[model samples]
Target: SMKIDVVTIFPEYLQPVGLVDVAVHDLRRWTHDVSVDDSPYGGGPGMVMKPTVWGDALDEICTSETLLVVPTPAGYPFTQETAWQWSTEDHLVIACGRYEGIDQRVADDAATRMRVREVSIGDYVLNGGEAAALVIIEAVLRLVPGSLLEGPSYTRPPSWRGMDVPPVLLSGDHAKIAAWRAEQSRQRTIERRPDLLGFDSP
Candidate 1:
């Protein structure tokens, strides 16, 4: 159970986020409560989530134990490696921003005070960071222990609805499974997100 703290103006709205309900199911044993803070800074184009609110929330809930993240459209891409890491972390906090963005000074302070980083779920803009946070929170935290009935299974890329699942998945050949996944992952990435290949791929 990785505790999460979200800083946003629309904190209440997050109560109904589908991911929150999913995370709740992951609480059979030890639960990590998700917290949120919504407040305003003195002046900003859009509502600026006051750093003071974050400080107070952290004071009550965060120890030296939580990793903080701010969702941004201009940050690094999310990946499976991150999900694995989150499974091992003690806590995870996300700051979902809105309008123009949170106050730069608050974010800067958070960078030094907490294990804060900015992340973008994909190469697109959401109405606000809440949606992006939901994507990330669901993707990363689901890897935590006791979260699923068993580890979840997925079919990606080459095995996409049309791409077809590799025969090796049912062949019971471990090595063959690896080879198939690798080829399909690359091939599908190339076919869909061709730019990810860096040069010649498809």
Candidate 2:
């Protein structure tokens, strides 16, 4: 089973969800006990997160086989393609940062233990990375073969209030059904995220 270890002051965020329970042998699960804001950087605005807390937290789990990921608005944009690619990894270590931002040297140091990637959920900013990690974990889990229903689904009472669940789905014509569903995906993509049709968005 692939393992995911999340290090954050708010371990409660990831712990409350069984979908992200990290199973380890250690009894004392180390984490950022309190918000670390001892800083000496940043021209203006909030205090920068010190590297000591993050370094110590990660040090407890860092391994040669581990892949580290730090969530940041300034990092590379997160996408479905990225999720699919990361699913192949044996282990994923997510470092959640707060305040202004994490110290750069921390990321540099983590690179020595395992492959590190800085990912962003959207163009907007948040109070911390815990929120982004929640969304990211759900997206990644859905890609797991047996974890979810990969194919689209329908139910009885198809003729609800006023809308029907499309007859093509119930027709039992596999070929025609596949074609129609494919077109629907294309149309929906165009309407919502047109940039994803061919070009990229970030």
| Tens-digit lDDT track of model 1 for 19-85 | 3222221111122334222334555344554455555544554455667777888777777777777
List, residue by residue over 90-139, the lDDT tens digit for candidate 2: 78877887777788899999898789999999989898888887777777
The segments of candidate 1 whose C-alpha lies over 4 angstroms from its true place after superposition are 16-50, 147-187, 200-202
Model 2, C-alpha of 14: deviation from truth (Å): 1.7
In lDDT terms, how accurate is model 1?
0.61
Worst 10 residues of 1 by lDDT: 22-31
Stretches of candidate 2 off by over 4 Å are 18-35, 39-42, 142-154, 199-202
lDDT of 2 at 64: 80
Superposition error at 148 for model 1 (Å): 24
